[PDB]
Design a protein around this ligand. Structure first.
Ligand SMILES: OC[C@H]1O[C@H](O[C@H]2[C@H](O)[C@@H](O)[C@H](O)O[C@@H]2CO)[C@H](O)[C@@H](O)[C@@H]1O
Ligand SMILES: OC[C@H]1O[C@H](O[C@H]2[C@H](O)[C@@H](O)[C@H](O)O[C@@H]2CO)[C@H](O)[C@@H](O)[C@@H]1O
Lengths: 233, 233
């Protein structure tokens, strides 16, 4: 479906309703003007164990976020739209919110063509951003739907800590859904062309797990859980 | 509508059919692998007086393009999808074409939510690109649908040449369609936040004309024609 509105209030309610449904990760791109509007909906999302991956033009006071969950903040100056993408399944977009908050066009959709287009947009923003904050409140259960965020996390931590994974994804040879477990032993992150995957050692050998829309890897996944080595002991 | 395919051949035919309908401008983002596939469809588009704004990871041999029309090429390393957006009205996208050309998911749509998402994607690519070629074969009739491309052109030429315009667009106060004529006397291009407009001197004073989805300007337009000063004499 596509749901449409010209009420900022209605759109923000749809945004909140979308975040409330999240099980793994929400990616939020927001003008800093609207951080206070969504701050508590962030907090409540983190408190369910869902990852929040925020993009914002100025880093706010994040005192309140201490220990609340798994939270990543990247600085990107500047997108004038509020975007939320939940579990890679649904997006809510408020267009040009910086300039009209009020009556802007907004939409919510699960259509894969819209998700592809926005996934691609978010990856360009990712390339154009800098990581400013990472809080890993739950190192036994670090969830992602976006493999490029998962791989960025691997890149920053693998040299110092072992990282285990549970992944549900599509076997690109057979087309069937599988659940894999094992140890992350490497990764590919070719930033400029947006190729990204983890190399996961399983009982069947080391396989490559790509993200949404993957082609070259052995698996495609939007359901990723990492477990830091030693965290469960 | 949304049209979908898993045939590269079918998708390329849809891409060609979309370009064939263009009246003002086509934006094409292509891996360089596919330039030869679309080269002649570029040429034929230019020969109708339509602007081609190409993004590509490596600049090809463009000998053949000499004098053919109004052609802009920007280098961007690298997008793995073929995207064509025609007149701001329709997009065709072939996902991950670099890796599968063959059976990739492709789509064609006129839905404004898809156009908004891809317009936004293309603007990020624009920010991340460098202009490598500009050929102005028809200086009396330089057409655009994308105001950020039109403003980039103004930025590079206004100091050296007068530039006149004919614009059809929506008056953002009245909501009605108008046709405006006059002289371009300035512009706004705030690259990092993607604000872009021309300042057009009309018989009613100097007005700001923004592009698709504009809010802060006096007009929104996807139907822009520039005429270089002295070109008609
Ligand atoms: O199998 C190759 C990669 O495919 C996808 O990456 C795409 C992404 O879907 C798209 O939004 C973006 O614009 O381009 C990249 C690369 O072409 C997977 O998400 C990746 O994990 C794969 O590496
Ligand atoms: O009126 C402000 C600007 O609105 C639009 O620009 C948007 C664009 O639609 C969107 O795709 C992009 O991501 O952000 C920009 C800026 O918020 C018009 O196209 C512009 O011409 C206006 O300046």
């Amino acid at each position: 479906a596509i749901w449409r509105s010209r009420s900022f209030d209605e759109a923000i309610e749809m945004f909140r309703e979308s975040l409330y449904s999240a099980k793994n990760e929400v990616i939020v791109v927001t003008p800093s003007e609207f951080f206070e509007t969504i701050r508590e909906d962030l907090i409540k999302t983190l408190e369910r164990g869902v990852t929040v991956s925020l993009y914002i033009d100025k880093i706010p006071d994040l005192s309140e976020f201490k220990g609340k969950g798994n939270f990543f903040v990247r600085q990107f100056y500047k997108l004038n739209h509020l975007i939320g993408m939940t579990d890679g399944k649904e997006v809510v977009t408020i267009q040009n919110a910086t300039f009209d908050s009020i009556g802007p066009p907004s939409f919510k959709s699960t259509y894969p063509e819209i998700i592809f287009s926005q996934y691609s947009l978010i990856i360009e923003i990712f390339k154009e951003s800098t990581l400013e904050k990472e809080i890993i409140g739950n190192p036994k259960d670090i969830r992602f739907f976006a493999m490029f965020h998962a791989v960025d996390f691997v890149k920053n931590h693998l040299k110092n800590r072992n990282i285990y994974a549970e992944i549900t994804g599509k076997n690109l040879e057979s087309g069937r859904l599988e659940t894999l477990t094992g140890r992350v032993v490497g990764y590919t992150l070719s930033l400029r062309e947006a190729v990204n995957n983890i190399h996961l050692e399983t009982e069947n050998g080391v396989v490559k797990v790509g993200g949404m829309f993957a082609v070259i890897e052995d698996y495609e996944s939007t359901e990723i859980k990492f477990i830091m080595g030693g965290s469960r002991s």
